[model samples]
Target: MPEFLEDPSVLTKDKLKSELVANNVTLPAGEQRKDVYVQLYLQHLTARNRDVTELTNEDLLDQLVKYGVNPGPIVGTTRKLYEKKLLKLREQG
Candidate 1:
């Protein structure tokens, strides 16, 4: 783990913008992104301690794609298989 999300109260706007931008979340809300960091940061923080098993499929999909993983085609398969993959690759890669 990178240890960034380990402390929520330690978060600051500059650290957040730097992290999010590097991850391609660049200016998610632009000028008034005011508080929008909450969504990305919260989602990432939550994505931390939980298994993709508990993640909604689309949210799982969002994480997979946003983090630079490809799920190929999902229509023909169940969420659990890729969900497990997502959890492992979240850190393993």
Candidate 2:
């Protein structure tokens, strides 16, 4: 799991900004929250051994629109989903 999975709130905007810069992703002037969520989502998946480099903001945004959800609220669902996945993984051990 990702370092921040235990407490996703630790993903501060400043830290996310640094990560975005490191990943060569340009932070949009207006869509800051969306950008951050995308990064967090990718980071979360990466921690699970998923290769998310090929994923794009456009794809994530499209999914959000398709599901009729906003970035902020989705974070909660994402956390729950991952928690379940982690629990299942642990149970298999």
Candidate 3:
């Protein structure tokens, strides 16, 4: 194990950023939680048939469970906003 493992919490943000960097994930500059960004990054990775090692947020996984194995939109407006942003970024890319 690495020395950083000695204090897992201390490395939470660093590890999150490192993983994002490794996976070629970029976030829009703003206030946002690492947990959310990580999941979104995973979505893109999954889209390209990249293997996602894990999900960092249990609640996100739980929400999927409560909603459906392969769920439709649970939060309609938020979903639209996310899709809009994703499309805008896709266009920019």
* Per-model CA lDDT versus the true structure: 0.36, 0.32, 0.29
Residue-wise lDDT of candidate 2 within 1-93, one digit each (tens)?
A: 223233223343333333333333322232435334444434333334331222233344322222222333223234323222222221221
lDDT: worst 10-residue window of model 1: 26-35
Q: What is the C-alpha RMSD of each candidate to the true structure, in Å?
A: 12.7, 12.0, 13.5
Cα lDDT of model 3 by residue, 1-93, tens digit? 011111111223333334344333344443244334334333433223221113223322222222122222223223222222222222222
| Ranked by TM-score, top first | 1, 3, 2
What is candidate 1's TM-score against the reference? Answer: 0.37
**lDDT for 69 (candidate 3):** 23
Candidate number of the best TM-score: 1
Off by over 4 Å in 3: 1-11, 50-93
Pick by TM-score: 1 or 2, better one: 1
Model 1 lDDT, residue 33, Cα = 31
Model 3 lDDT-worst window of ten: 1-10
Could you tell me how far off, in angstroms, the CA of residue 16 lies in candidate 2 after the best superposition?
1.0
In model 2, what are the clashing residue pairs, if there are any?
Answer: none
Model 1 alpha-carbon drift over 4 Å, by segment: 1-50, 76-78
* Count of steric clashes across candidates, in order: 0, 0, 0
